[PDB]
Amino acid sequence: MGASKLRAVLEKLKLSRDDISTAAGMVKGVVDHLLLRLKCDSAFRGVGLLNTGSYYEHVKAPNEFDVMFKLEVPRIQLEEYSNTRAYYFVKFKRNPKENPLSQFLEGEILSASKMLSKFRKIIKEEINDIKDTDVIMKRKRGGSPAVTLLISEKISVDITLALESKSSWPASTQEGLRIQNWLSAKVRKQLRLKPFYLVPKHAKGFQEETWRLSFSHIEKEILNNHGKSKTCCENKEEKCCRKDCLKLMKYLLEQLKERFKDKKHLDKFSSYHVKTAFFHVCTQNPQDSQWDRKDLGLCFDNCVTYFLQCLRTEKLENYFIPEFNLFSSNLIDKRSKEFLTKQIEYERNNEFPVFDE
Ligand SMILES: O=c1nc[nH]c2c1ncn2[C@@H]1O[C@@H]2COP(=O)(O)O[C@H]3[C@@H](O)[C@H](n4cnc5c(=O)nc[nH]c54)O[C@@H]3COP(=O)(O)O[C@H]2[C@H]1O
Ligand SMILES: [Zn+2]
């Protein structure tokens, strides 16, 4: 596939400045309201907005947003569940002390379901009272930590609540973030000093009171500063195609998901898998020269091939948690991965007709 053929698709995916300004304004307009009204509680007092991009995550629809609500918790003690390296129980070291979130304490373990229930209920009751904009609160999805709302029957916003921990990263993430050859071990050192987050997600019956590790902020960090050279993409001679490869991959997965929307094979595949795979390829190809713009197509293929391999071998390690396989037999069944593999292979073999619209 030609580089200009791909960059043409990327060119057509570009949304104008107005489409960003108006939608962004309509989003922040409700985000500020919900944010300020959430402060009217002892629990969600120190709530805050976390920058997980503050824009859209999927290229095509640009009417879908994703915001993350951070809530700091002091000196928490985590307890890994069932040797699932990603999922944890939240306990407090100072149990004798009275906690603001004490109402949600399921004993010594902080219940995620209660917090999600109160949070979501507050959102529903506030979305009821707003009159300046037409907003409806979307139905609860299957085991989703998010709360979605629709503004003016066109804008989708997924609000995800998350606990913040300034303490050192868990031992499961120790051998993760292998960016030493890519962004230097210094940057890894300084990045691991940053806080980590926790989202209310249950692990497989289901253990409904567990939390998942989240490093979305770090993903944004390495994503916006992606080159081995510090002046990468700041000058003409240092333009690369990492972000373009990520856009192309995400768009391919999205379009494939939409083509077979009627089926249920690709419903479990999300942009996070694509992101993860892309990070793995970045680790594999750390040199900026390996990401020359004129090599876009080739680069894209590298992102495709590897991804296919992960589907073929049923192995896709979480970039921060190596021992956690996103493509395990438990999470996603072989049949679906075979389907996606066949589709992607077809696309590549026929010059990606899914891009042509
Ligand atoms: O950490 C977060 N930061 C911002 N929003 C988040 C986060 N976690 C959840 N959500 C919000 O809830 C939606 C559904 O979540 P679900 O737990 O059911 O499945 C996730 C999950 O399997 C995987 N995923 C996504 N983020 C991570 C990660 O940080 N660490 C490990 N896995 C991850 O993608 C799938 C869906 O991707 P989407 O983003 O489309 O839709 C999310 C999102 O809206
Ligand atoms: Zn670059």
Numbering used by the authors: 160 to 219, 222 to 365, 369 to 521
Quoted passage from the original study:
Cyclic GMP‐AMP synthase (cGAS)* is a sensor of cytosolic double‐stranded DNA (ds‐DNA). ds‐DNA in the cytosol may occur from infection or mitochondrial damage. cGAS is activated by ds‐DNA binding to catalyze the cyclization of ATP and GTP to form a cyclic dinucleotide with mixed 2′,5′‐ and 3′,5′‐phosphodiester linkage (2′,3′‐cGAMP), which in turn activates stimulator of type 1 interferon genes (STING). Activated STING causes the activation of TBK1, which phosphorylates IRF3 allowing it to translocate to the nucleus where it triggers interferon‐inducible gene activation and interferon production. We report here the structure of cGAS with dinucleotides and small molecule inhibitors, and kinetic studies of the cGAS mechanism.
To study the β‐pseudo‐active form we obtained structures of an N‐terminal truncation of cGAS starting at residue 161 (cGAS161)22 in complex with five cyclic dinucleotides (2′,2′‐cGAMP, 2′,3′‐cGAMP, 3′,3′‐cGAMP, 3′,3′‐cdIMP and 3′,3′‐cdUMP), and the linear 2′,5′‐GpAp dinucleotide. In four of these structures, cGAS assumes the β‐pseudo‐active conformation. There is always an interaction between the catalytic acid Asp227 and the dinucleotide when the β‐pseudo‐active conformation occurs. In most cases Asp227 forms a hydrogen bond with the amino group of the guanine base with an approach between 2.5 and 3.3 Å. The exception to this is 3′,3′‐cdIMP which does not have an amino group on its base, but does interact with Asp227 through the 2′‐OH guanine ribose (3.2 Å). Additionally, we observe that in all our cyclic dinucleotides structures, this site had better defined electron density than the other nucleobase site, even for identical ring systems like 3′,3′‐cdIMP and 3′,3′‐cdUMP. Most of these dinucleotides have affinities weaker than 500 μM (the top concentration tested).
